[PDB]
Amino acid sequence: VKYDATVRNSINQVVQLRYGEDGLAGESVEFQNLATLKPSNKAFEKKF
Amino acid sequence: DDEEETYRLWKIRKTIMQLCHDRGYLVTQDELDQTLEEFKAQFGDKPSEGRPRRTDLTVLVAHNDDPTDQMFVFFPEEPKVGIKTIKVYCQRMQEENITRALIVVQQGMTPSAKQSLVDMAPKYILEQFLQQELLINITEHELVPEHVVMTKEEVTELLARYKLRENQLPRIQAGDPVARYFGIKRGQVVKIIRPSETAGRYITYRLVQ
Amino acid sequence: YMHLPQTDNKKKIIITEDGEFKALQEWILETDGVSLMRVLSEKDVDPVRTTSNDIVEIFTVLGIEAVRKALERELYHVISFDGSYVNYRHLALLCDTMTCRGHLMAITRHGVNRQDTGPLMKCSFEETVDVLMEAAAHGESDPMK
Amino acid sequence: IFPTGDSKVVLPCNLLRMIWNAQKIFHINPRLPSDLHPIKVVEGVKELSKKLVIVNGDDPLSRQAQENATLLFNIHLRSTLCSRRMAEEFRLSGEAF
Amino acid sequence: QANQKRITTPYMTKYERARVLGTRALQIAMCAPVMVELEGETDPLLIAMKELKARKIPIIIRRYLPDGSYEDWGVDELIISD
Description:
Chain A is α+β, with helices and mostly antiparallel strands. Chain A is built from 1 helix and 3 strands; from the N terminus they run E-E-E-H. Chain A has one helix at 41-47, and strands spanning 7-8, 14-16, 30-33. In chain A, strand 1 (7-8) and strand 2 form a beta hairpin. Chain B has 7 helices and 10 strands. The radius of gyration of chain B is 19 Å and the shape is globular. Chain B starts with a helix and ends with a strand. Chain E is of the alpha+beta class. Chain E has helices at 14-29, 44-54, and strands at residues 60-64, 70-74. Chain E has one domain (1-82): Eukaryotic RPB6 RNA polymerase subunit (Alpha-Beta Complex), CATH 3.90.940. A two-stranded antiparallel ribbon of chain E has the order 1-2. Chain E starts with 13 loop residues before the first helix and ends in an 8-residue tail after the last strand. In chain E, helix 1 (14-29) crosses helix 2 (44-54). Classes of the chains: A alpha+beta, B alpha/beta, E alpha+beta. Strand 3 (30-33) of chain A pairs antiparallel with strand 1 of chain D. Chain B: Keywords: DNA-directed RNA polymerase, Nucleus, Transcription. Chain B: InterPro entries: Arch_Rpo5/euc_Rpb5 (IPR014381), RNA_pol_Rpb5_N (IPR005571), RNA_pol_Rpb5_N_sf (IPR036710), RNA_pol_subH/Rpb5_C (IPR000783), RNA_pol_subH/Rpb5_CS (IPR020608), RPB5-like_sf (IPR035913).
Protein backbone atom coordinates (compact mmCIF):
# COMPACT_ATOMS: atom_id res chain seq x y z
CA VAL A 1 0.00 0.00 0.00
CA LYS A 2 1.44 3.34 -1.08
CA TYR A 3 0.54 6.58 0.68
CA ASP A 4 -2.29 7.26 -1.74
CA ALA A 5 -3.85 4.21 0.00
CA THR A 6 -3.75 2.43 -3.36
CA VAL A 7 -2.44 -1.13 -3.46
CA ARG A 8 0.16 -1.32 -6.22
CA ASN A 9 2.59 -3.82 -7.69
CA SER A 10 6.38 -3.46 -7.82
CA ILE A 11 6.28 -1.34 -10.99
CA ASN A 12 3.30 0.76 -9.83
CA GLN A 13 0.40 -1.19 -11.32
CA VAL A 14 -2.78 -0.40 -9.40
CA VAL A 15 -4.03 -3.77 -8.16
CA GLN A 16 -6.74 -2.32 -5.91
CA LEU A 17 -7.89 1.28 -5.59
CA ARG A 18 -8.26 0.73 -1.84
CA TYR A 19 -7.08 -2.18 0.28
CA GLY A 20 -9.87 -4.72 0.61
CA GLU A 21 -12.23 -2.38 -1.31
CA ASP A 22 -12.53 -0.24 1.86
CA GLY A 23 -9.02 0.71 3.03
CA LEU A 24 -9.44 -1.05 6.39
CA ALA A 25 -6.69 -3.23 7.82
CA GLY A 26 -7.57 -6.71 9.01
CA GLU A 27 -6.54 -6.43 12.67
CA SER A 28 -9.37 -4.07 13.73
CA VAL A 29 -12.38 -5.71 12.02
CA GLU A 30 -15.06 -7.66 13.88
CA PHE A 31 -18.06 -9.83 13.10
CA GLN A 32 -21.37 -7.97 13.33
CA ASN A 33 -25.03 -8.33 12.37
CA LEU A 34 -26.64 -5.80 10.05
CA ALA A 35 -30.04 -6.27 11.75
CA THR A 36 -31.81 -4.71 8.74
CA LEU A 37 -31.55 -7.19 5.86
CA LYS A 38 -33.37 -10.12 7.49
CA PRO A 39 -36.46 -8.49 9.10
CA SER A 40 -39.58 -8.46 6.96
CA ASN A 41 -41.24 -5.33 5.59
CA LYS A 42 -43.83 -5.23 8.37
CA ALA A 43 -41.20 -5.81 11.06
CA PHE A 44 -38.87 -3.29 9.42
CA GLU A 45 -41.55 -0.59 9.44
CA LYS A 46 -42.50 -1.46 13.02
CA LYS A 47 -38.91 -1.28 14.27
CA PHE A 48 -37.66 1.77 12.31
CA ASP B 1 -36.87 -27.80 -36.86
CA ASP B 2 -38.80 -24.62 -37.69
CA GLU B 3 -39.76 -24.08 -34.04
CA GLU B 4 -36.20 -24.40 -32.71
CA GLU B 5 -34.89 -22.14 -35.47
CA THR B 6 -37.58 -19.62 -34.55
CA TYR B 7 -36.54 -19.75 -30.90
CA ARG B 8 -32.88 -19.31 -31.79
CA LEU B 9 -33.62 -16.35 -34.07
CA TRP B 10 -35.86 -14.76 -31.43
CA LYS B 11 -33.16 -15.06 -28.78
CA ILE B 12 -30.50 -13.74 -31.16
CA ARG B 13 -32.62 -10.72 -32.06
CA LYS B 14 -33.49 -9.97 -28.43
CA THR B 15 -29.83 -10.15 -27.44
CA ILE B 16 -28.91 -7.91 -30.38
CA MET B 17 -31.39 -5.26 -29.24
CA GLN B 18 -30.02 -5.63 -25.70
CA LEU B 19 -26.50 -5.09 -27.03
CA CYS B 20 -27.62 -2.05 -29.01
CA HIS B 21 -29.35 -0.53 -25.99
CA ASP B 22 -26.35 -1.13 -23.72
CA ARG B 23 -24.02 0.40 -26.31
CA GLY B 24 -26.50 3.27 -26.59
CA TYR B 25 -28.79 3.46 -29.61
CA LEU B 26 -32.32 4.51 -30.57
CA VAL B 27 -33.84 1.14 -29.67
CA THR B 28 -37.55 1.38 -28.92
CA GLN B 29 -38.79 -0.28 -25.74
CA ASP B 30 -41.27 -2.42 -27.67
CA GLU B 31 -38.48 -3.61 -29.96
CA LEU B 32 -36.39 -4.54 -26.93
CA ASP B 33 -39.33 -6.43 -25.37
CA GLN B 34 -40.58 -8.75 -28.12
CA THR B 35 -42.43 -11.95 -27.30
CA LEU B 36 -42.11 -15.12 -29.36
CA GLU B 37 -45.65 -14.64 -30.67
CA GLU B 38 -44.83 -11.02 -31.49
CA PHE B 39 -41.77 -12.19 -33.43
CA LYS B 40 -43.93 -14.74 -35.25
CA ALA B 41 -46.47 -12.08 -36.20
CA GLN B 42 -43.97 -9.32 -37.05
CA PHE B 43 -41.06 -10.90 -38.98
CA GLY B 44 -43.01 -13.84 -40.32
CA ASP B 45 -43.60 -17.31 -38.86
CA LYS B 46 -41.74 -20.52 -39.65
CA PRO B 47 -38.15 -20.22 -40.98
CA SER B 48 -36.56 -22.61 -43.51
CA GLU B 49 -38.19 -21.28 -46.71
CA GLY B 50 -40.91 -19.31 -44.89
CA ARG B 51 -41.05 -15.56 -44.43
CA PRO B 52 -37.90 -15.58 -42.23
CA ARG B 53 -35.06 -15.75 -44.76
CA ARG B 54 -32.06 -14.59 -42.66
CA THR B 55 -31.84 -11.46 -44.83
CA ASP B 56 -34.81 -9.37 -43.65
CA LEU B 57 -33.72 -9.63 -40.00
CA THR B 58 -31.08 -6.92 -40.47
CA VAL B 59 -31.46 -4.01 -38.04
CA LEU B 60 -30.69 -0.32 -38.58
CA VAL B 61 -30.44 1.97 -35.55
CA ALA B 62 -28.92 5.39 -34.91
CA HIS B 63 -26.85 6.58 -31.96
CA ASN B 64 -28.28 8.68 -29.14
CA ASP B 65 -25.71 11.48 -29.10
CA ASP B 66 -25.68 11.99 -32.88
CA PRO B 67 -28.06 10.30 -35.40
CA THR B 68 -25.31 9.72 -37.98
CA ASP B 69 -23.38 6.64 -36.79
CA GLN B 70 -26.28 4.35 -37.76
CA MET B 71 -24.92 1.03 -36.56
CA PHE B 72 -26.23 -1.74 -38.80
CA VAL B 73 -26.15 -5.45 -37.91
CA PHE B 74 -26.02 -8.15 -40.59
CA PHE B 75 -27.19 -11.78 -40.64
CA PRO B 76 -25.34 -14.05 -43.07
CA GLU B 77 -27.33 -17.04 -44.29
CA GLU B 78 -24.53 -19.45 -45.15
CA PRO B 79 -23.13 -21.79 -42.47
CA LYS B 80 -19.70 -20.28 -43.33
CA VAL B 81 -19.29 -16.70 -44.58
CA GLY B 82 -16.89 -16.73 -47.57
CA ILE B 83 -15.01 -13.61 -48.90
CA LYS B 84 -17.58 -12.71 -51.66
CA THR B 85 -20.23 -12.26 -48.90
CA ILE B 86 -17.99 -9.79 -47.07
CA LYS B 87 -17.36 -8.03 -50.38
CA VAL B 88 -21.06 -7.44 -51.09
CA TYR B 89 -21.54 -6.54 -47.43
CA CYS B 90 -18.81 -3.92 -47.87
CA GLN B 91 -20.53 -2.58 -50.99
CA ARG B 92 -23.72 -2.11 -48.97
CA MET B 93 -21.60 -0.82 -46.04
CA GLN B 94 -20.30 2.00 -48.28
CA GLU B 95 -23.52 2.63 -50.22
CA GLU B 96 -25.63 3.52 -47.15
CA ASN B 97 -22.73 5.74 -45.89
CA ILE B 98 -22.66 4.34 -42.36
CA THR B 99 -19.61 3.49 -40.24
CA ARG B 100 -20.39 0.68 -37.77
CA ALA B 101 -21.82 -2.74 -38.56
CA LEU B 102 -21.93 -6.22 -37.03
CA ILE B 103 -21.95 -9.76 -38.43
CA VAL B 104 -23.69 -12.75 -36.84
CA VAL B 105 -21.92 -15.87 -38.09
CA GLN B 106 -23.85 -19.14 -37.97
CA GLN B 107 -21.01 -21.67 -37.60
CA GLY B 108 -17.64 -20.07 -38.34
CA MET B 109 -15.67 -17.73 -40.57
CA THR B 110 -12.50 -18.40 -42.62
CA PRO B 111 -8.93 -17.29 -41.71
CA SER B 112 -8.86 -15.19 -44.92
CA ALA B 113 -12.21 -13.54 -43.99
CA LYS B 114 -10.86 -12.70 -40.50
CA GLN B 115 -7.78 -11.20 -42.14
CA SER B 116 -9.99 -9.07 -44.45
CA LEU B 117 -12.10 -7.85 -41.52
CA VAL B 118 -9.15 -6.80 -39.36
CA ASP B 119 -7.02 -5.14 -42.06
CA MET B 120 -9.88 -3.66 -44.13
CA ALA B 121 -11.47 -1.89 -41.13
CA PRO B 122 -9.57 1.34 -40.45
CA LYS B 123 -12.62 3.20 -41.76
CA TYR B 124 -15.40 0.56 -41.70
CA ILE B 125 -15.31 -0.94 -38.21
CA LEU B 126 -16.71 -4.48 -38.27
CA GLU B 127 -17.16 -7.06 -35.52
CA GLN B 128 -17.63 -10.84 -35.31
CA PHE B 129 -20.21 -12.76 -33.30
CA LEU B 130 -20.79 -16.48 -33.52
CA GLN B 131 -24.43 -17.50 -33.52
CA GLN B 132 -24.33 -19.22 -30.12
CA GLU B 133 -22.74 -16.07 -28.66
CA LEU B 134 -26.04 -14.16 -28.84
CA LEU B 135 -28.30 -16.81 -27.27
CA ILE B 136 -27.45 -15.37 -23.82
CA ASN B 137 -26.91 -11.76 -22.80
CA ILE B 138 -23.65 -12.02 -20.87
CA THR B 139 -24.40 -8.85 -18.91
CA GLU B 140 -27.46 -10.36 -17.20
CA HIS B 141 -25.31 -13.19 -15.82
CA GLU B 142 -24.91 -12.97 -12.05
CA LEU B 143 -21.11 -13.26 -12.06
CA VAL B 144 -20.50 -10.52 -14.65
CA PRO B 145 -20.78 -7.09 -12.97
CA GLU B 146 -22.16 -4.00 -14.66
CA HIS B 147 -19.84 -2.41 -17.22
CA VAL B 148 -19.82 1.22 -18.36
CA VAL B 149 -17.72 2.70 -21.15
CA MET B 150 -15.84 5.83 -20.10
CA THR B 151 -15.49 8.81 -22.41
CA LYS B 152 -12.06 10.27 -23.10
CA GLU B 153 -12.55 13.42 -21.02
CA GLU B 154 -13.73 11.32 -18.08
CA VAL B 155 -10.59 9.19 -18.47
CA THR B 156 -8.44 12.32 -18.39
CA GLU B 157 -10.29 13.48 -15.27
CA LEU B 158 -9.63 10.10 -13.63
CA LEU B 159 -5.93 10.22 -14.50
CA ALA B 160 -5.64 13.75 -13.12
CA ARG B 161 -7.47 12.76 -9.94
CA TYR B 162 -5.37 9.68 -9.15
CA LYS B 163 -2.19 11.03 -10.81
CA LEU B 164 -1.60 7.72 -12.60
CA ARG B 165 -0.60 6.91 -16.18
CA GLU B 166 -2.47 4.87 -18.77
CA ASN B 167 -0.05 1.94 -18.51
CA GLN B 168 -0.39 1.75 -14.73
CA LEU B 169 -4.11 0.93 -14.80
CA PRO B 170 -5.40 -2.66 -14.80
CA ARG B 171 -5.70 -4.17 -18.27
CA ILE B 172 -8.42 -6.22 -19.96
CA GLN B 173 -7.93 -8.27 -23.11
CA ALA B 174 -9.48 -6.87 -26.27
CA GLY B 175 -10.75 -10.37 -27.07
CA ASP B 176 -12.65 -10.67 -23.80
CA PRO B 177 -16.33 -11.55 -24.45
CA VAL B 178 -17.50 -8.50 -22.49
CA ALA B 179 -15.29 -6.14 -24.50
CA ARG B 180 -16.50 -7.66 -27.77
CA TYR B 181 -20.08 -7.37 -26.53
CA PHE B 182 -19.58 -3.66 -25.86
CA GLY B 183 -17.54 -3.18 -29.05
CA ILE B 184 -14.77 -0.97 -27.66
CA LYS B 185 -11.52 -0.05 -29.41
CA ARG B 186 -8.12 -0.41 -27.79
CA GLY B 187 -7.12 2.44 -25.50
CA GLN B 188 -10.56 2.98 -23.98
CA VAL B 189 -11.30 2.45 -20.29
CA VAL B 190 -14.34 0.61 -18.93
CA LYS B 191 -15.71 1.41 -15.48
CA ILE B 192 -16.82 -1.62 -13.48
CA ILE B 193 -19.39 -1.48 -10.67
CA ARG B 194 -19.31 -4.75 -8.73
CA PRO B 195 -20.78 -5.67 -5.33
CA SER B 196 -18.44 -6.34 -2.43
CA GLU B 197 -19.08 -7.80 1.02
CA THR B 198 -16.63 -5.39 2.68
CA ALA B 199 -17.44 -1.97 1.16
CA GLY B 200 -20.89 -2.18 -0.47
CA ARG B 201 -19.65 -1.18 -3.91
CA TYR B 202 -16.27 -1.04 -5.63
CA ILE B 203 -15.21 1.05 -8.62
CA THR B 204 -12.59 -0.72 -10.74
CA TYR B 205 -11.04 0.52 -13.99
CA ARG B 206 -9.85 -1.68 -16.86
CA LEU B 207 -7.90 -0.31 -19.83
CA VAL B 208 -8.37 -2.40 -22.97
CA GLN B 209 -5.18 -3.44 -24.74
CA TYR C 1 -27.31 -35.79 -11.12
CA MET C 2 -30.66 -34.75 -9.64
CA HIS C 3 -31.05 -33.74 -6.00
CA LEU C 4 -32.82 -31.05 -4.01
CA PRO C 5 -30.22 -28.90 -2.20
CA GLN C 6 -30.31 -28.57 1.59
CA THR C 7 -27.57 -26.02 2.23
CA ASP C 8 -28.87 -22.49 1.74
CA ASN C 9 -26.02 -21.62 -0.66
CA LYS C 10 -27.58 -23.50 -3.60
CA LYS C 11 -31.21 -23.08 -2.50
CA LYS C 12 -33.57 -20.66 -4.21
CA ILE C 13 -33.79 -17.41 -2.22
CA ILE C 14 -36.15 -14.60 -3.24
CA ILE C 15 -37.93 -11.58 -1.79
CA THR C 16 -41.52 -12.33 -0.80
CA GLU C 17 -44.37 -9.86 -1.06
CA ASP C 18 -44.02 -9.42 2.72
CA GLY C 19 -40.29 -8.72 2.31
CA GLU C 20 -39.10 -11.74 4.31
CA PHE C 21 -36.64 -14.14 2.73
CA LYS C 22 -38.10 -17.62 2.26
CA ALA C 23 -35.98 -20.73 1.76
CA LEU C 24 -37.49 -22.24 -1.40
CA GLN C 25 -36.32 -25.65 -2.60
CA GLU C 26 -35.90 -25.97 -6.37
CA TRP C 27 -34.39 -28.72 -8.47
CA ILE C 28 -30.75 -28.28 -9.50
CA LEU C 29 -28.52 -30.22 -11.89
CA GLU C 30 -24.83 -31.00 -11.36
CA THR C 31 -22.99 -32.38 -14.39
CA ASP C 32 -19.61 -34.02 -14.76
CA GLY C 33 -17.49 -32.15 -17.28
CA VAL C 34 -18.07 -28.63 -18.57
CA SER C 35 -19.87 -27.45 -21.70
CA LEU C 36 -20.85 -24.15 -20.12
CA MET C 37 -21.62 -22.25 -23.30
CA ARG C 38 -24.05 -24.76 -24.80
CA VAL C 39 -25.49 -25.48 -21.35
CA LEU C 40 -26.41 -21.82 -20.97
CA SER C 41 -27.73 -21.75 -24.54
CA GLU C 42 -30.08 -24.66 -23.83
CA LYS C 43 -33.79 -24.13 -23.26
CA ASP C 44 -35.21 -23.98 -19.71
CA VAL C 45 -31.72 -23.28 -18.30
CA ASP C 46 -31.41 -20.19 -16.13
CA PRO C 47 -28.78 -17.92 -17.74
CA VAL C 48 -28.45 -15.91 -14.52
CA ARG C 49 -27.45 -18.20 -11.65
CA THR C 50 -25.79 -20.97 -13.66
CA THR C 51 -22.04 -21.25 -13.05
CA SER C 52 -19.20 -23.77 -13.21
CA ASN C 53 -16.05 -24.98 -11.47
CA ASP C 54 -13.69 -24.81 -14.45
CA ILE C 55 -11.78 -21.54 -14.80
CA VAL C 56 -10.68 -21.51 -18.44
CA GLU C 57 -14.20 -22.35 -19.62
CA ILE C 58 -15.84 -19.55 -17.65
CA PHE C 59 -13.04 -17.21 -18.75
CA THR C 60 -13.61 -17.94 -22.43
CA VAL C 61 -17.39 -17.68 -22.06
CA LEU C 62 -18.15 -14.79 -19.71
CA GLY C 63 -15.07 -12.61 -19.23
CA ILE C 64 -12.22 -11.67 -16.95
CA GLU C 65 -14.51 -10.08 -14.36
CA ALA C 66 -16.51 -13.30 -14.24
CA VAL C 67 -13.20 -15.07 -13.63
CA ARG C 68 -12.55 -12.72 -10.72
CA LYS C 69 -15.92 -13.27 -9.07
CA ALA C 70 -16.17 -17.02 -9.72
CA LEU C 71 -12.60 -17.73 -8.63
CA GLU C 72 -13.10 -15.71 -5.45
CA ARG C 73 -16.27 -17.67 -4.71
CA GLU C 74 -14.64 -21.02 -5.39
CA LEU C 75 -11.54 -20.26 -3.31
CA TYR C 76 -13.78 -19.12 -0.47
CA HIS C 77 -15.66 -22.40 -0.83
CA VAL C 78 -12.58 -24.63 -0.75
CA ILE C 79 -10.96 -22.77 2.15
CA SER C 80 -14.19 -22.57 4.15
CA PHE C 81 -15.29 -26.19 3.61
CA ASP C 82 -13.41 -27.50 6.66
CA GLY C 83 -14.73 -24.66 8.85
CA SER C 84 -11.56 -22.55 8.88
CA TYR C 85 -12.31 -18.93 7.98
CA VAL C 86 -10.07 -16.35 6.30
CA ASN C 87 -10.74 -12.68 5.71
CA TYR C 88 -12.05 -11.45 2.37
CA ARG C 89 -9.15 -9.00 1.93
CA HIS C 90 -6.55 -11.64 1.11
CA LEU C 91 -8.74 -13.64 -1.26
CA ALA C 92 -9.73 -10.42 -3.02
CA LEU C 93 -6.08 -9.41 -3.38
CA LEU C 94 -5.05 -12.79 -4.79
CA CYS C 95 -7.94 -12.94 -7.26
CA ASP C 96 -7.40 -9.34 -8.41
CA THR C 97 -3.65 -9.67 -8.85
CA MET C 98 -4.14 -12.81 -10.91
CA THR C 99 -6.75 -10.93 -12.99
CA CYS C 100 -5.02 -7.53 -13.06
CA ARG C 101 -3.15 -8.27 -16.31
CA GLY C 102 -6.24 -9.03 -18.42
CA HIS C 103 -5.51 -12.75 -18.81
CA LEU C 104 -5.46 -15.77 -16.51
CA MET C 105 -2.24 -15.33 -14.57
CA ALA C 106 -1.09 -18.77 -13.47
CA ILE C 107 1.01 -18.51 -10.29
CA THR C 108 3.88 -20.56 -11.79
CA ARG C 109 7.17 -19.82 -13.63
CA HIS C 110 5.00 -19.79 -16.82
CA GLY C 111 2.92 -16.82 -15.51
CA VAL C 112 5.02 -14.85 -13.04
CA ASN C 113 8.12 -14.54 -15.22
CA ARG C 114 6.13 -13.16 -18.21
CA GLN C 115 5.57 -9.72 -16.57
CA ASP C 116 7.28 -6.35 -16.87
CA THR C 117 8.64 -6.85 -13.33
CA GLY C 118 12.41 -6.67 -12.98
CA PRO C 119 14.70 -9.58 -13.89
CA LEU C 120 16.13 -9.79 -10.36
CA MET C 121 12.86 -10.66 -8.64
CA LYS C 122 12.06 -12.98 -11.55
CA CYS C 123 15.27 -14.96 -11.06
CA SER C 124 14.65 -15.39 -7.33
CA PHE C 125 11.62 -17.57 -8.21
CA GLU C 126 12.44 -20.48 -10.65
CA GLU C 127 14.00 -20.41 -14.22
CA THR C 128 16.75 -18.69 -12.22
CA VAL C 129 19.44 -18.81 -14.95
CA ASP C 130 17.24 -18.48 -18.08
CA VAL C 131 15.84 -15.19 -16.79
CA LEU C 132 19.29 -13.60 -16.62
CA MET C 133 20.21 -14.99 -20.04
CA GLU C 134 17.07 -13.42 -21.48
CA ALA C 135 17.75 -10.10 -19.75
CA ALA C 136 21.34 -10.00 -20.98
CA ALA C 137 20.26 -10.87 -24.52
CA HIS C 138 17.61 -8.13 -24.48
CA GLY C 139 19.62 -5.72 -22.32
CA GLU C 140 16.64 -5.35 -19.99
CA SER C 141 16.96 -2.68 -17.30
CA ASP C 142 15.69 -3.28 -13.77
CA PRO C 143 14.15 -0.19 -12.08
CA MET C 144 15.24 -1.48 -8.63
CA LYS C 145 11.91 -1.01 -6.86
CA ILE D 1 -26.18 -6.61 -2.75
CA PHE D 2 -26.61 -9.44 -0.22
CA PRO D 3 -28.70 -12.40 -1.42
CA THR D 4 -29.10 -15.60 0.64
CA GLY D 5 -29.88 -13.59 3.79
CA ASP D 6 -26.28 -13.72 5.02
CA SER D 7 -26.59 -11.11 7.75
CA LYS D 8 -23.13 -11.90 9.16
CA VAL D 9 -20.68 -9.32 7.79
CA VAL D 10 -17.33 -7.89 8.87
CA LEU D 11 -17.15 -4.20 9.80
CA PRO D 12 -14.53 -2.16 11.70
CA CYS D 13 -16.31 -1.03 14.86
CA ASN D 14 -18.55 -3.27 16.98
CA LEU D 15 -21.41 -0.81 17.32
CA LEU D 16 -23.51 -2.94 19.69
CA ARG D 17 -20.60 -3.37 22.09
CA MET D 18 -19.83 0.34 21.85
CA ILE D 19 -23.41 1.24 22.78
CA TRP D 20 -23.32 -1.27 25.64
CA ASN D 21 -20.06 0.26 26.89
CA ALA D 22 -21.65 3.70 26.79
CA GLN D 23 -24.65 2.41 28.75
CA LYS D 24 -22.60 0.77 31.49
CA ILE D 25 -20.03 3.58 31.64
CA PHE D 26 -22.58 6.38 32.13
CA HIS D 27 -24.89 4.26 34.33
CA ILE D 28 -27.84 5.00 32.06
CA ASN D 29 -31.07 3.61 33.52
CA PRO D 30 -33.16 2.04 30.72
CA ARG D 31 -36.35 2.31 32.78
CA LEU D 32 -36.47 6.09 33.12
CA PRO D 33 -36.99 8.33 30.07
CA SER D 34 -33.91 9.71 28.35
CA ASP D 35 -33.06 13.24 27.20
CA LEU D 36 -31.92 12.79 23.60
CA HIS D 37 -33.61 14.76 20.83
CA PRO D 38 -33.89 12.51 17.72
CA ILE D 39 -32.69 15.33 15.45
CA LYS D 40 -29.59 15.53 17.64
CA VAL D 41 -28.99 11.90 16.70
CA VAL D 42 -29.75 12.62 13.04
CA GLU D 43 -27.22 15.40 12.50
CA GLY D 44 -24.85 13.58 14.86
CA VAL D 45 -24.70 10.49 12.67
CA LYS D 46 -24.62 12.62 9.51
CA GLU D 47 -21.70 14.71 10.78
CA LEU D 48 -19.91 11.55 11.90
CA SER D 49 -20.37 9.95 8.48
CA LYS D 50 -18.95 13.12 6.95
CA LYS D 51 -15.88 12.95 9.21
CA LEU D 52 -15.13 9.32 8.23
CA VAL D 53 -13.16 9.54 4.98
CA ILE D 54 -11.43 6.78 3.04
CA VAL D 55 -11.14 8.64 -0.28
CA ASN D 56 -10.12 12.16 0.74
CA GLY D 57 -11.23 14.77 -1.77
CA ASP D 58 -13.94 17.12 -2.97
CA ASP D 59 -14.32 16.45 -6.71
CA PRO D 60 -17.37 14.40 -7.76
CA LEU D 61 -15.31 11.33 -8.67
CA SER D 62 -13.51 11.23 -5.31
CA ARG D 63 -16.79 11.85 -3.49
CA GLN D 64 -18.45 8.95 -5.31
CA ALA D 65 -15.46 6.73 -4.55
CA GLN D 66 -15.66 7.62 -0.85
CA GLU D 67 -19.40 6.94 -0.79
CA ASN D 68 -18.90 3.55 -2.43
CA ALA D 69 -16.03 2.61 -0.12
CA THR D 70 -17.86 3.61 3.07
CA LEU D 71 -21.36 2.52 1.98
CA LEU D 72 -21.46 -0.69 4.02
CA PHE D 73 -20.17 0.91 7.21
CA ASN D 74 -22.43 3.94 6.77
CA ILE D 75 -25.52 1.82 6.14
CA HIS D 76 -24.77 -0.43 9.12
CA LEU D 77 -24.15 2.67 11.25
CA ARG D 78 -27.46 4.25 10.28
CA SER D 79 -29.24 0.96 10.94
CA THR D 80 -27.74 0.65 14.42
CA LEU D 81 -28.13 4.36 15.27
CA CYS D 82 -31.74 4.74 14.11
CA SER D 83 -33.90 7.21 16.00
CA ARG D 84 -36.51 4.70 17.17
CA ARG D 85 -33.86 2.15 18.08
CA MET D 86 -32.01 4.69 20.22
CA ALA D 87 -35.27 5.85 21.81
CA GLU D 88 -36.46 2.34 22.74
CA GLU D 89 -33.72 -0.29 22.90
CA PHE D 90 -30.69 1.70 24.03
CA ARG D 91 -32.11 4.74 25.85
CA LEU D 92 -28.82 6.66 25.87
CA SER D 93 -28.36 10.24 27.07
CA GLY D 94 -26.88 13.21 25.24
CA GLU D 95 -23.41 12.88 26.75
CA ALA D 96 -23.63 9.15 26.04
CA PHE D 97 -24.35 9.87 22.39
CA GLN E 1 4.21 22.38 -2.12
CA ALA E 2 2.78 25.31 -0.16
CA ASN E 3 0.84 25.21 3.11
CA GLN E 4 -2.47 24.72 1.30
CA LYS E 5 -3.50 21.71 -0.85
CA ARG E 6 -1.91 19.43 1.79
CA ILE E 7 -3.83 16.16 1.27
CA THR E 8 -2.79 13.04 3.22
CA THR E 9 -3.94 11.21 6.34
CA PRO E 10 -3.11 13.43 9.36
CA TYR E 11 -2.77 10.31 11.57
CA MET E 12 0.93 9.65 12.17
CA THR E 13 0.89 5.88 11.80
CA LYS E 14 2.68 3.01 13.50
CA TYR E 15 5.49 2.67 10.95
CA GLU E 16 6.59 6.29 11.19
CA ARG E 17 5.99 6.01 14.94
CA ALA E 18 8.59 3.25 15.15
CA ARG E 19 11.02 5.04 12.84
CA VAL E 20 10.81 8.38 14.67
CA LEU E 21 11.08 6.78 18.11
CA GLY E 22 14.11 4.75 17.06
CA THR E 23 15.94 7.63 15.40
CA ARG E 24 15.26 10.07 18.25
CA ALA E 25 16.40 7.47 20.77
CA LEU E 26 19.61 6.95 18.79
CA GLN E 27 20.19 10.70 18.59
CA ILE E 28 19.84 11.13 22.35
CA ALA E 29 22.09 8.10 22.81
CA MET E 30 24.73 10.12 20.91
CA CYS E 31 24.53 13.06 23.35
CA ALA E 32 21.92 15.17 21.57
CA PRO E 33 19.77 17.90 23.18
CA VAL E 34 16.66 16.87 25.09
CA MET E 35 13.42 18.68 24.26
CA VAL E 36 11.55 18.26 27.57
CA GLU E 37 12.48 18.27 31.24
CA LEU E 38 13.35 14.80 32.55
CA GLU E 39 13.08 13.50 36.12
CA GLY E 40 15.64 10.76 36.62
CA GLU E 41 15.30 8.84 33.34
CA THR E 42 18.31 7.34 31.56
CA ASP E 43 16.98 4.84 29.01
CA PRO E 44 16.85 6.63 25.62
CA LEU E 45 13.64 4.83 24.65
CA LEU E 46 11.63 5.90 27.70
CA ILE E 47 12.65 9.55 27.38
CA ALA E 48 11.81 9.35 23.67
CA MET E 49 8.31 8.15 24.60
CA LYS E 50 7.85 10.89 27.19
CA GLU E 51 9.03 13.70 24.91
CA LEU E 52 6.85 12.40 22.07
CA LYS E 53 3.95 12.56 24.52
CA ALA E 54 5.08 16.14 25.14
CA ARG E 55 4.79 16.59 21.35
CA LYS E 56 8.13 18.33 20.79
CA ILE E 57 9.85 16.09 18.23
CA PRO E 58 12.50 18.13 16.29
CA ILE E 59 12.00 16.07 13.11
CA ILE E 60 9.81 16.60 10.04
CA ILE E 61 8.59 13.54 8.14
CA ARG E 62 8.87 13.61 4.34
CA ARG E 63 6.23 11.46 2.65
CA TYR E 64 6.70 10.03 -0.84
CA LEU E 65 3.50 9.95 -2.86
CA PRO E 66 3.44 7.29 -5.60
CA ASP E 67 3.67 9.88 -8.39
CA GLY E 68 7.01 11.19 -7.12
CA SER E 69 6.13 14.45 -5.39
CA TYR E 70 7.05 14.61 -1.72
CA GLU E 71 4.89 15.98 1.09
CA ASP E 72 6.50 17.21 4.30
CA TRP E 73 4.79 16.90 7.69
CA GLY E 74 6.01 18.17 11.01
CA VAL E 75 5.31 16.03 14.04
CA ASP E 76 3.61 18.70 16.13
CA GLU E 77 0.71 19.19 13.70
CA LEU E 78 0.23 15.42 13.55
CA ILE E 79 -1.93 14.03 16.36
CA ILE E 80 -0.84 10.84 18.10
CA SER E 81 -2.89 7.70 17.50
CA ASP E 82 -2.92 6.87 21.22
